Amino acid sequence: RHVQWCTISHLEQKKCNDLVGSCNVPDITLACVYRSSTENCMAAIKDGQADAMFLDSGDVYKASLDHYNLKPIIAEPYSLHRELTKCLKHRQESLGGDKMVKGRYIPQCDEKGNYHPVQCHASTGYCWCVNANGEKIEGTNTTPVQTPPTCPSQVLTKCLKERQEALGGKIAIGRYIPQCDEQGNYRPMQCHGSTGYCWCVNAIGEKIEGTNTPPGNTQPTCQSHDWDTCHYAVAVVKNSSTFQFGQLKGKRSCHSGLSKTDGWNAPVNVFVEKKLLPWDGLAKGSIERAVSKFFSASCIPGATETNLCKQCIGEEEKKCKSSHDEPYYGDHGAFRCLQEDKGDVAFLKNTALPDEHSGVYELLCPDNTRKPLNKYKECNLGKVPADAVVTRKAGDKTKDINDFLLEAQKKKCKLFGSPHGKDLMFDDSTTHLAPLPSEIDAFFFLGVKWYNAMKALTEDVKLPSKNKVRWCTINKPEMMKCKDWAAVSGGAIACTEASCPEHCVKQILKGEADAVTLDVQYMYMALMCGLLPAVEEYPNKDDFHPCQIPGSTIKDFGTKRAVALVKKSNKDIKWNNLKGKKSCHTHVGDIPGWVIPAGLISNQNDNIDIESFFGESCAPGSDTNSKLCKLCIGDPENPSTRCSLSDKEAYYGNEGAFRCLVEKGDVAFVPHTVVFANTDGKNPAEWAKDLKSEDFEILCLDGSRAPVTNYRGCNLSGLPPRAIVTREESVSDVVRILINQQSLYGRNGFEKDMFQMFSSAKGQNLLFNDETQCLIEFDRQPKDIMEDYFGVRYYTAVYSASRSAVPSELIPACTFKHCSNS
Numbered sequence: 163r164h165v166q167w168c169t170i171s172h173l174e175q176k177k178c179n180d181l182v183g184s185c186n187v188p189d190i191t192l193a194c195v196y197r198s199s200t201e202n203c204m205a206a207i208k209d210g211q212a213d214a215m216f217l218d219s220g221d222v223y224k225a226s227l228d229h230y231n232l233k234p235i236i237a238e239p240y241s242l243h244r245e246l247t248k249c250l251k252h253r254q255e256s257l258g259g260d261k262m263v264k265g266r267y268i269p270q271c272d273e274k275g276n277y278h279p280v281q282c283h284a285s286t287g288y289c290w291c292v293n294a295n296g297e298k299i300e301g302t303n304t305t306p307v308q309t310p311p312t313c314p315s316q317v318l319t320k321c322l323k324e325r326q327e328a329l330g331g332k333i334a335i336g337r338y339i340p341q342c343d344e345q346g347n348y349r350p351m352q353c354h355g356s357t358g359y360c361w362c363v364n365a366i367g368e369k370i371e372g373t374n375t376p377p378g379n380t381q382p383t384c385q386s387h388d389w390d391t392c393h394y395a396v397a398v399v400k401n402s403s404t405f406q407f408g409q410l411k412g413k414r415s416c417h418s419g420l421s422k423t424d425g426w427n428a429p430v431n432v433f434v435e436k437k438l439l440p441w442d443g444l445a446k447g448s449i450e451r452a453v454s455k456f457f458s459a460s461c462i463p464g465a466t467e468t469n470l471c472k473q474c475i476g477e478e479e480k481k482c483k484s485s486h487d488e489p490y491y492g493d494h495g496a497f498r499c500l501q502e503d504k505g506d507v508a509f510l511k512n513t514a515l516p517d518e519h520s521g522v523y524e525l526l527c528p529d530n531t532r533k534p535l536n537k538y539k540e541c542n543l544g545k546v547p548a549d550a551v552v553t554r555k556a557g558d559k560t561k562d563i564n565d566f567l568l569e570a571q572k573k574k575c576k577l578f579g580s581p582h583g584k585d586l587m588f589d590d591s592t593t594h595l596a597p598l599p600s601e602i603d604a605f606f607f608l609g610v611k612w613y614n615a616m617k618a619l620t621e622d623v624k625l626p627s628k629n630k631v632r633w634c635t636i637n638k639p640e641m642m643k644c645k646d647w648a649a650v651s652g653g654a655i656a657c658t659e660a661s662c663p664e665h666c667v668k669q670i671l672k673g674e675a676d677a678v679t680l681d682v683q684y685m686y687m688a689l690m691c692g693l694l695p696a697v698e699e700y701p702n703k704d705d706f707h708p709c710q711i712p713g714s715t716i717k718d719f720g721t722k723r724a725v726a727l728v729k730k731s732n733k734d735i736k737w738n739n740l741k742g743k744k745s746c747h748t749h750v751g752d753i754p755g756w757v758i759p760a761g762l763i764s765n766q767n768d769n770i771d772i773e774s775f776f777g778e779s780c781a782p783g784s785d786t787n788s789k790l791c792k793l794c795i796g797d798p799e800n801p802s803t804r805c806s807l808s809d810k811e812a813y814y815g816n817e818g819a820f821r822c823l824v825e826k827g828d829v830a831f832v833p834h835t836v837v838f839a840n841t842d843g844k845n846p847a848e849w850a851k852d853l854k855s856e857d858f859e860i861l862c863l864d865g866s867r868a869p870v871t872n873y874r875g876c877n878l879s880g881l882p883p884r885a886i887v888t889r890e891e892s893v894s895d896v897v898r899i900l901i902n903q904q905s906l907y908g909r910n911g912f913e914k915d916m917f918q919m920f921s922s923a924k925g926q927n928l929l930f931n932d933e934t935q936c937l938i939e940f941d942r943q944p945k946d947i948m949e950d951y952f953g954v955r956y957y958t959a960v961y962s963a964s965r966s967a968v969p970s971e972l973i974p975a976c977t978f979k980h981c982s983n984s
């Protein structure tokens with residue numbers, strides 16, 4: 163296996179070549195491929211000439227576009243603010259669950275708020291081992307009859323671990339040994355035990371620039387509890403000059419480079435906001451030209467304007483290249499340009515500032531003051547996104563790149579410094595590189611605010627009208643019905659196309675669409691990504707009053723209620739003893755007949771297979787050999803149609819599960835409507851025949867029973883309605899436009915002869931479900947949106963009332979946190 167790294171300079175190629183020799187990762191060989199600039203490397207990776215390079219966030223954005231089609235895959239983790247530990251969050255979530263779901267696992271946290279390595283489930287007496295994230299180590303469960311397992315100790319904190327490594331297992335004399343606090347985080351002030359120097363670090367141990375102090379001098383105050391580890395764009399100046407930020411016009415400037423976010427996007431955004439630059443849209447020429455009029459002479463590697471390359475010092479064709487062969491390229495090159503007095507101000511980020519407190523440099527704040535180097539958090543041009551290793555979108559080398567860097571970091575190879583110079587291959591300030599979420603792209607990595615801000619400098623971005631709802635459609639018939647809606651809507655409705663509901667959620671997140679109707683099984687993912695219900699489908703045929711007068715009180719929303727249905731004859735069966743019994747399920751994947759029962763059973767029995775929990779059962783979709791297909795009859799006109807997802811199975815579906823109950827089962831998992839639909843001689847067939855409703859009851863979660871009529875107070879869970887989701891800031895617009903459309907084209911629409919929202923000749927259930935009575939505004943309560951939309955019962959039964967389930971690999975990408983401003 164091979165990884166070919168693209169380098170942009172002779173200096174970087176030298177360092178990459180040293181790593182080929184010095185860094186021995188078994189099974190993966192590194193090789194180095196030289197190109198003369200950042201853009202030529204981007205093209206080499208797109209073309210397969212190389213596999214990976216490290217890019218500034220501004221180039222991550224440029225590389226994501228169709229010319230190159232690259233994506234970020236590895237980056238340094240960062241933190242925005244201190245958070246609850248994972249164990250304490252899990253305890254709070256599970257204590258907030260539905261108390262009628264009895265016997266749930268509540269985690270056990272220790273005096274630092276971490277998981278005890280041994281976790282136990284009170285109601286079942288089972289114990290198991292966990293990792294630092296509280297996830298079960300599979301195959302360590304022990305039953306109550308045995309003593310609790312022996313579980314390895316928890317991994318030490320960053321500080322205690324680096325203290326252990328520094329000590330090397332026998333004092334490390336003459337070397338820095340980190341000093342940790344009681345919680346095992348880094349003390350704010352650190353001192354070198356041999357040189358006498360002291361400096362400040364944040365809570366995860368990163369040095370604060372501008373704080374390094376030789377012995378005998380006064381130390382700057384170190385801030386405690388600093389968990390803001392985003393990097394900051396800053397403007398650095400010498401204390402021998404005296405201009406302020408608003409007098410930059412006509413000065414000389416050094417920039418890390420034309421495409422870098424700290425050397426271009428951040429300062430330029432501020433120039434534009436302050437109107438120091440006469441420029442707003444692409445009608446006034448390019449940004450680069452306007453900047454060319456502002457400064458008298460600059461070094462901005464990668465620029466074309468002549469005065470913006472005037473102060474660079476690269477020899478011959480190397481001059482002004484996005485490459486270390488231009489000595490003023492990058493953060494440290496821009497600082498060198500100030501230091502050598504080719505510029506009056508350098509634009510870079512806090513991680514390239516001097517570590518020493520004392521000296522001739524300080525920061526130029528945009529509020530027209532100057533502040534010391536260590537005050538960049540209050541004197542800056544914005545937080546900037548993380549930088550990242552990128553590769554082709556297809557990801558054919560992602561695993562090899564990840565494996566190599568994880569192994570090289572484990573072995574402590576010299577990835578992050580070099581004799582040959584600074585910031586070669588990676589930023590010298592980097593300490594660890596970790597894999598990003600597998601579905602991350604530039605949009606989710608940079609975040610919507612920085613992504614749009616960098617788009618804004620390249621094109622005028624016409625913002626879509628808040629008076630138009632772009633509806634996302636998932637198949638061609640839906641598209642065609644939405645084109646008919648658009649034609650009658652007077653421009654209120656437009657249409658977009660995607661292949662599946664998850665891709666619609668992506669389009670709405672990225673501003674390509676505005677709304678989509680989602681089944682229940684997608685709402686957890688939509689709500690985690692930050693969309694909100696705007697309106698919901700009301701399905702109750704018996705009461706039209708909430709549809710007639712909007713806003714009025716809904717007596718019964720009318721969704722299905724999952725129940726456990728048993729015969730009045732069998733009077734021993736209660737909820738708490740279904741184990742081993744024979745059960746009938748509509749089919750695997752059905753929410754009321756499977757997801758809700760499987761959910762409650764795993765919550766109360768340590769995630770035991772619902773296949774193993776019951777005795778013999780019928781649940782179409784299971785494997786024909788398993789005990790879940792034994793009751794499954796098949797087709798009476800024998801063909802093999804057994805345990806199949808069709809009507810060719812006698813026991814399939816809502817009626818079929820009810821069949822299996824009366825014929826040969828103790829319990830059936832079904833919506834509450836099925837019993838009334840097949841009793842009181844409502845079904846003609848011979849098995850139904852008579853079968854009085856009062857011959858059955860439903861099981862309550864508290865061990866009691868009730869007649870099949872009290873499903874509102876004695877069910878497993880009610881389902882929430884389907885919802886129309888949108889972005890939070892668009893909810894009020896979408897509600898207004900849809901309610902208006904509904905007064906025209908709903909079931910009592912004033913213009914319902916011109917168009918019907920809730921039916922179509924083109925297909926069934928297009929855009930909305932065909933039995934929808936109307937759409938009702940979602941009344942947002944002051945509570946967690948999970949609990950608000952699902953209801954506490956469903957949230958607990960299906961998701962353990964947790965925000966940590968991952969039913970879709972999009973969730974880790976769309977919840978990735980960003981380094982944005984306000």
Ligand SMILES: NC(=O)OC[C@@H]1N=C(N)N2C[C@@H](OS(=O)(=O)O)C(O)(O)[C@@]23NC(N)=N[C@@H]13
Nearest residue numbers: 716719882883941942943950951952953954
């Ligand atoms: N009447 C009725 O059912 O309205 C449904 C409507 N939409 C939902 N998805 N919900 C879930 C229900 O949760 S539940 O536990 O009460 O079922 C709810 O009623 O709270 C509700 N939450 C809010 N804010 N409005 C409600």
